[PDB]
Ligand binder design. Structure first.
Ligand SMILES: [Ca+2]
Ligand SMILES: [Ca+2]
Ligand SMILES: [Ca+2]
Ligand SMILES: [Ca+2]
Ligand SMILES: [Ca+2]
Ligand SMILES: [Ca+2]
Ligand SMILES: [Ca+2]
Ligand SMILES: [Ca+2]
Ligand SMILES: [Ca+2]
Ligand SMILES: [Ca+2]
Lengths: 280, 280, 281, 280
């Protein structure tokens, strides 16, 4: 009954087309067996292609359906990605249309709560620089949604976190730690906390950005939700490096570095000597 | 990110090898400086105040944070001490909140893993009586954290080892040599070993407390790991006076020692010789 | 997939499976208003209203969302929100530079204004109309759509409510949205203007005097069926007035446009198109 | 290599069982890529068996390993489940060893953080009655981990939420809304908040358990995490009923009801008739 709804995404009519989209849009809302049902009927290419509709009613509906398909299994996120949604999503990040801009951020956020494979895709697709740009928005709804999306990215592996750092996000995050808007403060603390829970390098970048005095100050907050997030972030700062040191020691590092003691490249040699000195 | 990095230390790809090395050298420097930055930015006084918080959720985060700060070098541990943390930590040893009691013990355990100035501070804050009471906990999670901490204390000098003996830890530690839990058995053994590593009134009181028959009997354990610790302990005792050798003579040690020579475990065959040599 | 699978076991052959499926649908059909009433009876509204003055954006937003949910109940539930004193704070939040807070308050106001006339009139009496009207020229499509939705609920009341909307200067801005390239705003504008056009001859006349007809008439040539439908409904409403009203739609040239619709594939169209051309002879 | 490590997991040689155990737990503690290597080798089945071992060092290692793997993607979780872990993990809830008990819980809570069929495998294995009993534990560590697990379960579809209700969870959740312990209280709010985000019947159970007066008291809390969590739950109670009424309307419920006036059974006609009236 359902590849019928699909072919009608191609329909000359807009009551028909939007009957179809409205239908497919609610079905996508009902959990993973239903999402896959939409997927297998081949809905993704149609829905991606409507991302360029000049009709905002078609556009926001398609956008909303992709976001919902993106809110299921990693495997279902991967299908959105495979359909080529990312490049389009990234362009919509420039919409002067606040409501389209928010739907696309939300969609990206959802994709970015996937595995590190789908986070890397979002990163490869060029999304970090627009997200960071948006950290300056005077619209607190877009700002919140951007912080969130960045938060999920910063919840991947260390290279994911490092991309976020390398895209320039930290100075903004640290200024928002002074914000008198508790909702924004807390989403920026949340994202910053994710950064702080990578390894040595990631922790160092947070420290070099001047987060610590701002975090120490938040420990006077009568707001226990913000106090808890400042303390959790601080405890990551204080633990991450030694825990990484010990995990590389566990992963084979002494041996590896001894073998390189005698490297024939001299620069690699001194550096390997230097690094064994450190894992003492 | 870590097994990758280590395998890349052997990579025939030169830029791959080199950047992997650079990362690994940074991770090798550890976290102590990052911890210091936390101290320098003023976090200690607030963490210490929060240790009297009646909010369990906050108090846990604060304890964890301090515990990690105490996972640093002796400088960072000493800073937690001079911040006034110890009185409240020793208080928390009476908490009926198992989640708070475990973090406090852990934290105390890191402090106790510094040098003897740091161990002495923990003794002098009165940690020992509680820690001894905890050796008879039916709660293995709590028992083992207490054993851990006691062990670190008992790895200090003879004044540290005596404080422990004086606090009445030996009977408890000995009862635990009858434990059918191998994780507790091993740690009780390690702690006994550290005690027997002291001078001669130290080696004596351990003998005095009836350790040897359990010790000897453990040599027959077919679990090489618990065998080692028991050997090592009996070897530390062997190392002592003459009344002391005569004491390990008397508890039927020679029979058991005699077999361990053929052991494919290189280490065990060394120590096992050392000890028989030592009697006479 | 609990709900589609439920809707299928009603057509099912098995009697047990039909039975219990129906038993669940029935409870679900009864909706959430008694559950909203229980939240009210346990004493939540006074703290919820207090939280509206809160410096904490996080707490304020959640409160706003709770209130708006409570107000998404029946008229009894809306009236309890009103009586607990929420409107002054809601109307206050209409000036807020915070878009997030602004949207929740518009939304909350929107739900209050989907009640009966007594509920709508309370919103009107709290002074919400001038800010709603000013927000119809916001460059923010999210804020604008929410203010349009609210005003349309308000204009879906009695003539006294419709006239309040008119008296607050809504029409110039509603007409100007008739030129929007944004289909979603255009449809809501048409709908609001359709409601206003569904009151008395003097309300209909104010719509004409505001210049709606020229835009309305063009919208009849729209390739967009959904836009074309709302345009027709509104024009239809206007056609449903006294002689002077019928003349003005004659004199904006609605007749040619309305004939070029009798031959239309679409369904709700020709019947309405017909009834419209009918009303002018 | 990895393939004879698996073979040695079922060796009689106790020593190389444990080297083979430790190594597998090492590599399987970093990244999803390594987890899979461990999986495809065939570690899972053997690892499940070691959950029977009377050696704690062995038991806890196996268990912690499974724990780590269960903290990957839904299909990694699924592979733990396919391996047969659940009946063992559920049994381990009866352990008098607190460390084992907590590790069994944490493992269960990770598995239960997957998609809905994973959550459902956990219900199916009979975890709910054990989880519900734990809600009376005087151990706050065990108590909190049980609530977290039940929280994860209640984050599935209404059928999963209903299975937490049917198992008797609500009266303890309700009582814990009075707890002066903020960590326990917050975790119960979260669980209850997940329950209340379900359908008309799920909200009705929460109402009938007398949640509302306590949730309403919480609106006076000076703790903004708690206050926010009480607003949220109350918000879900106020919306889920109407939102589900509309969701069934979209699911075609009207054609189906009208169709039932055509039943030969008056009861059915009457109910369908009462239903169609109500759906306005
Ligand atoms: Ca068309
Ligand atoms: Ca357009
Ligand atoms: Ca703003
Ligand atoms: Ca507070
Ligand atoms: Ca026990
Ligand atoms: Ca504020
Ligand atoms: Ca705009
Ligand atoms: Ca045992
Ligand atoms: Ca307790
Ligand atoms: Ca408390």
């Amino acid at each position: 009954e359902l590849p019928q709804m699909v072919q009608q995404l191609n329909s000359p009519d807009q009551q028909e087309l939007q009957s179809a989209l409205r239908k497919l849009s609610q079905i996508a809302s009902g959990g993973n067996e239903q999402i896959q049902a939409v997927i297998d009927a081949g809905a993704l290419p149609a829905l991606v292609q409507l991302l360029s509709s000049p009709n905002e009613q078609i556009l926001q509906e398609a956008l909303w359906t992709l976001g919902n398909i993106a809110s299921g299994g990693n495997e279902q996120i991967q299908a959105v990605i495979d359909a080529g949604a990312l490049p389009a999503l990234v362009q919509l990040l420039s919409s002067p249309n606040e409501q389209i801009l928010q739907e696309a951020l939300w969609t990206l956020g959802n994709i970015a709560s996937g595995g590190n494979e789908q986070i890397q895709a979002v990163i490869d697709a060029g999304a970090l620089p627009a997200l960071v740009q948006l950290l300056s928005s005077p619209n607190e709804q877009i700002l919140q949604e951007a912080l969130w999306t960045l938060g999920n990215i910063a919840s991947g592996g260390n290279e994911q976190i490092q991309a976020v750092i390398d895209a320039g996000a930290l100075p903004a995050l640290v200024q928002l730690l002074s914000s008198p808007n508790e909702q924004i403060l807390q989403e920026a603390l949340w994202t910053l906390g994710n950064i702080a829970s990578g390894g040595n390098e990631q922790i160092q970048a947070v420290i070099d950005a001047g987060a610590l005095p701002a975090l120490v100050q938040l420990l006077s907050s009568p707001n226990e939700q913000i106090l808890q997030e400042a303390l959790w972030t601080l405890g990551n700062i204080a633990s991450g490096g030694n825990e990484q040191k010990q995990a590389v020691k566990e992963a084979g590092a002494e041996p590896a570095l001894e073998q390189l003691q005698s490297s024939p490249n001299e620069k690699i040699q001194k550096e390997a000597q230097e690094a064994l000195e450190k894992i003492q």
